[PDB]
Design a protein around this ligand. Structure first.
Ligand SMILES: Nc1ncnc2c1ncn2[C@@H]1O[C@H](COP(=O)(O)OP(=O)(O)O)[C@@H](O)[C@H]1O
Lengths: 435, 322, 193, 97, 48
C-alpha cells in the first residue's frame, strides 16, 4: 500500500505483487520459524525450505537465504547492500547513540520495525551485552511516533512497577465504554521496555505474577484496577521485553501462554569478524586524533579482539557470577583509549600500547577474585601486545606499575608510583583537617 | 625593569625558613620594606625582603594562623586562626591589642576594609562577619553560603565583598545592605582563592575580552576565582558572566592576583609552580618551579619589583622581577 | 445581552442547551481575548526595547535571552494564528488560554526587570522623570509608531498636548495644545535623520 | 505599586477597553479625614492631577467625577470643603412613608 | 528487598517512577523550574 501511495501513476501490478508476496512469505517463514535460534539453525531451515519450496530463491551457492531481504520490486537483494563501511566522527567514538551497521544489526532492525509497526509485543533474547537494547533503540529511531519507557525487572518485581509507570506516563480517563488508560501525550505509542522479564520469581506453583499481568494486558487489552475493581482498557500502549536465555542462572522459562502473543528474536554475540568491523571502525575514527598513530588501527583492533575473546573463554559464570564479558567491555575499552588520547597532541606507539594495556587491566582484571586469574591477565596482555605489536620497546610500554591519573597533571597521563604516593600523603594531610 | 611589566624570574633572591609548620599566607607591608608570613605553627613571623633577614615573631594565637592582612596605613595587622579567634596587632609595638571571638568554627580568612574601620572575616560556620576595629563588636553577619567559606575580599572602595566557599560558588555581597549582589557558580570544584581587579586593569580586561565600552565609562568590577578544578576564571560582577577561563595549572589553584600594572595575572597552585598569565591572549607566559612542595600563597608588591610565595615546605621565597 | 434577554424570555426552556453552549463560547472568547490584548501590547512595546537598544544585550544578558525565548514562542503562536485566523480556530487551539497566561506572566516578569534600564534611560531626556515606568516603556518601545505617543506629551510639557506630523509621520511639523491651538515650527524636526 | 484609587484612575485614563467613552464615577463611601483626603487636593482643584511620590502625575479625564458620600464632615478641613460642590441630604429628604 | 528494587531502578534509569507522588511531585516540579531557570533553560511542561 505504501508503494502504491509512492507511485500514484503506476500502482503495483498483479505479477509484481505475486512475486513480492511469494518472496516475502518465504522471508517471513524464515524469520518467524527461526528468528529465535542460532545462525546454524537458521541456515538449516533455509536449506530445508530451498529443498521443499517452488518459489524463486537466490542463486548464491553458499550464502543462505537469511542474508537476502525482499525488495519492493519483487526480487531478492542481499542485506550486505545496506551495510556500508561508514566513517564515524571522532567526537562520536563509541558513543551510546552510535551504531556501526552490520549484517545482523540491519536484519534485526528490519525485523523489529516489522514487528514494532504492528504494535505487536516482542521479546529480544540473548546473552548480556549482545546488543538487544541497542538494536531496539535503533529500530525505534525509525518510528518517530513511539516513546519508549525503560523498566528494569528483578527477582522482586511485581505488577506494581508497571502500575507506577502507568501512573507517571499515562492517565485513567472515563469513557462511555469504560475506563481507558492512554499516554498523557497524544498521537504517540508508549513502549514499555522491560529489560529482565524472566528474572521475576516463580512461586512454588510455577508462575510469575508480573508475567501473568503482562499476558492479561496483551491478550485481553487491559487489566483490572484493584482499587475499585474496574476493568481498565489499554490504549496506545505497547510492550517490548528483553532477557537472557532461560538456561542462564537466575532466569526462569516464560509461560507458553505468554509466548504465543510474543515473537522472540535471538540476538547472539557479534562474531570475531563483526567485532573486528565495528571496533576497527571505532579505532579508525579514534586514531585520527594522532595522525602518526593512524597506521596502527588494524593491529590495535586485532589485539583488542584477541584479548577479549581469550578473556571471555577463560573466565565464565561457572567460576564467578560476575565473570560476564560482552561487547560492552570492548565499548568501554574504546571509550577509555579515546578519552586518554583526546588531550594529547602527539604520542608514540609505546604510549598507545601502554594506554591499551591500562584499559585492559581496568576492564578485565579488576573484577577477578583469585590471584592466579590476575597473573594470567597480566601475562596474556603482555603476550597479546607483543604478538600484534612487534618491534616496540617492551619495557617502556609494559612497566608493571601501569598507573594513569590526572591528579598530578591537567590531563590523563601515566603517573609514577612514588610521586603519586607523596601527593596522596599530602592530600591525606589536608583530608584529615577537612573531612 | 619596565615599571608595569616586570614578572618574577627563576633565580630566587632569598629562601627564608624559620617556620616549623607549613606557611599559610604571605603579605607585603604597604609602607615599610618589611614582610609578614603566617604559618600553621600559630606564629606570625616578620621578615625584611631587601636583605632577607628574620626580624620578630608575633605569637599569641593558640592554633594555626590561616590569614593575615594590613590596613591601608600599615599600622594594624589583623590575623585569624584555627582557634576561632581574630587578633588585631599594633604593628608599631607588635602587641595584640584586641582578640575577637564569635565565629563557631575555624576562621579561614580575614580582611580589613579599605576605610580601615571594619574587619571582615570568613569561617567554617558558613558565615561572614564584620567587626568594628575600635570596639571589636560584631556588627554584621553575611549568611547564605551553604558550606565552609574559604576567603573574603573587599573591593577597592569597600562597597562590595566577594567570598568563595566549599559549595563551589563565589558570592558578591553588598557591604551596606547585606544583599547578595551576584552568585558566580561555574567552577566544577571547591573555589580556593579570589582576587579583585585593580582599576589599572579595567581597560586591559575590556580590550582583551572584547567588551564594548559601556555608556557609563565604568566597565564594572572584575573578579578572579582560583579553584580546585585547576582553572582560573575572570568574572564581570556587574553582569555575573565569566569573561574567560584560564587553563594550564596541573593541580588545585591556591592563590591568584593581578600584576600591579594590570597587565598580567600571577597565580600559584599545588603543582609546585608559580605561573604568570597573559590574559590578553588567555595563555600562560612563564612557569616558575617555585617550591619543592605545595605553594599555598603569593603576594606581589605594589611598587617594588618583588614577588613572595609561601609553601607547605615551611619556606618563604622572595623573587626578583626583571 | 441578547443571550440574557433570551434567558428571561418564557420560551427559553426548549432552547436552554444551545443558549448555554453559546454563553460558554462567548465567555471563553472574552476571557481569552482580554488576556490576549494585554499580551500583544506588552510584546509590542517590549520587542522595541530589546531590539532598538544595542546596550541592553550587555547590561541585561539573562533577561535578554529570556526575552528572545519568549518572543520566539510568541511568534510561533502568532504564526499558528495566521495559519487559521478564524476566531473559533484560535479559540480551539490546544492550550491557548494557558499559553496566553504563561506569556502574560513571563512578559510581566521581564517588564519588572527593566527598572534599572528605564531609570538610566531617563537621564538622556530629562522630561522622562515625570513619566511612569509603564508609560516610559510604551514611549521608548513604540517610538516607531508615533501615532500612539500623542497621549504622553501632556505629562512631559506644560501645554503641548500633541504634536503635528506630516503624512509620512516622519517629520515633526509642530505642536498642539488641548484647545486646538497650534504652533508651527519654523524648521521642522525630521525623525528619520 | 498602584493603590486602589490610583489603579482605578490609571485604568480609566489608559482606556484600553474604551473607559474614556463612558461616564466613570468614583464614589468614596466612608469617613473623611485629612490623612487620605488631602492627597486629593490637587485632584479636586483646578489642577485636576493626582501627583504620586514617584513623580508621576495623572490628569483627571473630563468624563471622571470624584464623589464623596459622607454622613458628617466634623474632621474634614477647610481645604477639602472648599474644593468640592456640597449637596446636603437632610433626614427629612427620605420620609418614613 | 524494596530498598534493592529502588536501587535497581535508580541505577539503571537515573529516576524512580513512583518516588515522587502527590504533593512531592508538585514540589519537585517547582524546584525543577527553579533549577532549569538557574541553568539558563526555559522548561514548562512537567514531561520536560
Ligand atoms: N554494530 C555495533 N555498533 C556499535 N556498537 C555495538 C555494535 N554491536 C554491539 N555494540 C556494543 O555492544 C553493546 C551492547 O550493549 P546493550 O545493547 O546494552 O546489551 P543489552 O541490551 O544486552 O544490555 C553496546 O555497548 C555497543 O557499544
Amino acid at each position: 500500500a505504501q508503494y502504491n501511495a509512492n507511485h500514484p501513476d503506476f500502482p503495483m501490478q498483479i505479477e509484481q505483487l505475486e512475486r513480492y508476496i511469494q518472496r516475502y512469505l518465504v522471508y517471513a517463514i524464515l524469520w518467524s520459524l527461526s528468528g529465535d535460534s542460532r545462525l546454524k539453525m537458521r541456515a538449516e531451515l533455509g536449506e530445508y525450505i530451498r529443498r521443499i519450496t517452488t518459489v524463486p530463491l537466490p542463486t548464491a551457492p553458499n550464502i543462505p537465504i537469511i542474508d537476502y531481504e525482499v525488495s519492493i520490486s519483487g526480487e531478492w537483494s542481499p542485506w550486505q547492500a545496506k551495510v556500508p563501511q561508514i566513517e564515524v566522527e571522532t567526537h562520536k567514538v563509541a558513543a551510546p547513540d552510535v551504531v556501526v551497521p552490520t549484517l545482523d544489526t540491519v536484519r534485526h532492525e528490519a525485523l523489529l520495525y516489522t514487528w514494532l509497526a504492528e504494535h505487536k509485543p516482542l521479546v529480544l533474547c540473548g546473552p548480556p551485552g549482545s546488543g538487544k537494547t541497542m538494536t531496539l533503540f535503533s529500530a525505534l529511531r525509525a518510528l518517530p511516533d513511539m516513546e519508549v519507557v525503560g523498566l528494569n525487572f528483578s527477582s522482586a518485581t511485581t505488577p506494581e512497577l508497571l502500575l507506577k509507570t502507568f501512573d507517571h506516563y499515562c492517565e485513567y480517563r472515563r469513557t462511555p465504554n469504560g475506563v481507558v488508560l492512554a499516554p498523557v501525550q497524544l498521537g504517540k505509542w508508549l513502549v514499555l521496555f522491560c529489560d529482565e522479564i524472566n528474572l521475576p520469581d516463580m512461586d512454588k506453583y510455577g508462575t510469575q505474577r508480573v508475567i501473568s499481568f503482562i499476558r492479561q494486558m496483551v491478550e485481553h487489552g487491559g487489566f483490572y484496577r484493584t482499587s475499585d475493581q474496574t476493568w481498565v482498557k489499554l490504549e496506545r500502549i505497547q510492550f517490548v521485553g528483553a532477557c537472557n536465555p532461560p538456561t542462564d542462572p537466575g532466569r526462569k522459562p516464560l509461560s507458553h501462554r505468554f509466548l504465543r502473543h510474543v515473537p522472540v528474536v535471538y540476538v547472539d554475540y557479534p562474531g570475531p569478524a563483526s567485532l573486528t568491523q565495528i571496533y576497527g571502525t571505532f579505532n579508525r575514527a579514534m586514531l585520527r586524533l594522532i595522525p602518526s598513530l593512524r597506521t596502527y588501527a588494524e593491529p590495535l583492533t586485532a589485539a583488542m579482539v584477541e584479548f577479549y575473546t581469550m578473556s571471555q573463554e577463560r573466565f565464565t559464570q561457572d567460576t564467578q557470577p560476575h565473570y560476564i564479558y560482552s561487547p560492552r567491555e570492548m565499548t568501554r575499552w574504546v571509550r577509555g583509549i579515546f578519552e586518554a588520547l583526546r588531550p594529547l597532541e602527539t604520542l608514540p606507539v609505546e604510549g598507545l600500547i601502554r594506554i591499551w594495556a591500562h584499559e585492559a587491566l581496568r576492564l578485565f582484571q579488576d573484577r577477578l577474585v583469585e590471584d592466579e586469574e590476575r597473573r594470567w591477565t597480566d601475562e596474556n596482555i603482555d603476550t597479546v601486545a607483543l604478538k600484534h605489536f612487534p618491534n616496540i620497546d617492551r619495557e617502556k610500554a609494559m612497566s608493571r606499575p601501569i598507573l594513569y591519573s590526572n591528579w598530578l597533571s591537567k590531563d590523563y597521563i601515566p603517573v609514577d608510583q612514588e610521586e603519586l604516593r607523596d601527593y596522596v600523603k599530602a592530600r591525606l594531610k589536608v583530608f584529615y583537617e577537612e573531612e | 625593569r619596565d615599571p608595569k611589566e616586570w614578572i618574577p624570574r627563576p633565580p630566587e633572591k632569598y629562601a627564608l625558613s624559620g617556620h616549623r609548620s607549613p606557611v599559610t599566607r604571605v603579605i607585603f607591608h604597604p609602607v615599610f620594606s618589611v614582610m609578614v608570613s603566617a604559618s600553621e605553627d600559630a606564629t606570625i613571623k616578620v621578615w625584611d625582603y631587601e636583605t632577607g633577614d628574620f626580624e620578630r615573631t608575633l605569637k599569641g594565637h593558640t592554633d594555626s594562623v590561616q590569614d593575615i592582612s594590613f590596613d591601608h596605613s600599615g599600622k594594624l595587622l589583623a590575623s585569624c586562626s584555627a582557634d576561632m579567634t581574630i587578633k588585631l596587632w599594633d604593628f608599631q609595638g607588635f602587641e595584640c591589642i584586641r582578640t575577637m571571638h564569635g565565629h563557631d568554627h575555624n576562621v579561614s580568612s580575614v580582611a580589613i576594609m579599605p576605610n580601615g574601620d571594619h574587619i571582615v572575616s570568613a569561617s567554617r560556620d558558613k558565615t561572614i562577619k564584620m567587626w568594628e576595629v575600635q570596639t571589636g563588636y560584631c556588627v554584621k553577619t553575611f549568611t547564605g553560603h551553604r558550606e565552609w567559606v574559604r576567603m573574603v575580599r573587599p573591593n577597592q572602595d569597600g562597597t562590595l565583598i566577594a567570598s568563595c566557599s566549599n559549595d563551589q560558588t563565589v558570592r558578591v555581597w553588598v557591604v551596606a545592605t547585606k544583599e547578595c549582589k551576584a552568585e558566580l557558580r561555574e567552577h566544577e570544584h571547591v573555589v580556593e582563592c579570589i582576587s579583585w581587579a585593580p582599576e589599572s586593569s579595567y581597560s586591559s580586561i575590556s580590550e582583551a575580552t572584547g567588551s564594548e565600552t559601556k555608556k557609563s565609562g565604568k566597565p564594572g568590577p572584575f573578579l578572579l576565582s582560583g579553584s580546585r578544578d585547576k582553572t582560573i576564571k575572570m568574572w564581570d560582577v556587574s553582569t555575573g558572566m565569566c569573561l574567560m577561563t584560564l587553563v594550564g595549572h596541573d593541580n588545585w589553584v591556591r592563590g591568584v592576583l593581578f600584576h600591579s600594572g594590570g597587565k598580567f595575572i600571577l597565580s600559584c597552585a599545588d603543582d609546585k609552580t608559580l605561573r604568570v598569565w597573559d590574559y590578553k591572549n588567555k595563555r600562560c607566559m612563564k612557569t616558575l618551579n617555585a617550591h619543592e612542595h605545595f605553594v599555598t600563597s603569593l603576594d606581589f608588591h605594589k611598587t617594588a619589583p618583588y614577588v613572595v610565595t609561601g609553601s607547605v615546605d615551611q619556606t618563604v621565597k622572595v623573587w626578583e622581577c626583571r | 445581552n441578547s443571550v440574557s434577554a433570551m434567558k428571561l424570555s418564557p420560551y427559553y426552556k426548549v432552547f436552554e442547551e444551545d443558549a448555554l453552549s453559546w454563553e460558554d463560547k462567548l465567555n471563553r472568547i472574552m476571557a481569552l481575548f482580554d488576556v490576549w490584548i494585554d499580551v500583544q501590547r506588552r510584546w509590542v512595546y517590549l520587542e522595541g526595547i530589546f531590539t532598538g537598544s544595542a546596550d541592553i544585550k550587555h547590561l541585561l544578558p539573562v533577561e535578554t535571552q529570556r526575552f528572545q525565548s519568549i518572543s520566539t514562542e510568541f511568534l510561533a503562536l502568532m504564526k499558528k494564528v495566521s495559519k487559521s485566523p478564524l476566531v473559533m480556530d484560535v479559540l480551539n487551539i490546544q492550550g491557548v488560554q494557558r499559553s496566553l497566561e504563561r506569556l502574560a506572566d513571563l512578559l510581566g516578569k521581564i517588564q519588572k526587570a527593566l527598572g534599572e534600564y528605564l531609570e538610566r534611560e531617563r537621564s538622556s531626556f530629562p522630561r522622562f522623570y515625570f513619566v511612569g515606568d509603564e508609560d516610559l516603556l510604551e514611549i521608548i518601545g513604540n517610538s516607531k509608531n508615533v501615532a500612539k505617543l500623542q497621549k504622553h506629551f501632556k505629562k512631559m510639557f506644560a501645554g503641548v498636548s500633541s504634536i503635528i506630523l506630516n503624512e509620512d509621520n516622519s517629520v515633526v511639523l509642530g505642536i498642539s495644545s488641548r484647545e486646538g491651538e497650534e504652533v508651527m515650527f519654523k524648521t521642522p524636526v525630521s525623525i528619520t535623520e | 505599586t498602584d493603590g486602589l484609587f490610583t489603579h482605578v484612575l490609571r485604568k480609566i485614563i489608559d482606556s484600553v477597553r474604551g473607559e474614556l467613552q463612558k461616564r466613570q464615577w468614583i464614589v468614596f463611601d466612608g469617613d473623611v479625614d485629612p490623612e487620605w483626603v488631602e492627597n486629593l487636593n490637587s485632584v479636586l482643584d483646578d489642577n485636576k492631577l493626582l501627583t504620586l511620590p514617584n513623580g508621576e502625575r495623572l490628569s483627571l479625564p473630563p468624563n471622571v467625577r470624584i464623589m464623596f458620600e459622607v454622613q458628617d464632615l466634623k474632621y474634614a478641613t477647610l481645604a477639602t470643603v472648599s474644593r468640592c460642590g456640597m449637596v446636603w441630604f437632610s433626614e427629612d429628604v427620605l420620609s418614613t412613608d | 528487598s524494596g530498598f534493592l528494587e529502588r536501587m535497581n531502578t535508580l541505577l539503571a534509569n537515573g529516576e524512580v517512577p513512583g518516588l515522587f507522588e502527590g504533593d512531592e511531585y508538585a514540589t519537585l516540579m517547582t524546584q525543577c523550574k527553579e533549577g532549569a531557570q538557574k541553568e539558563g533553560l526555559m522548561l514548562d511542561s512537567h514531561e520536560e
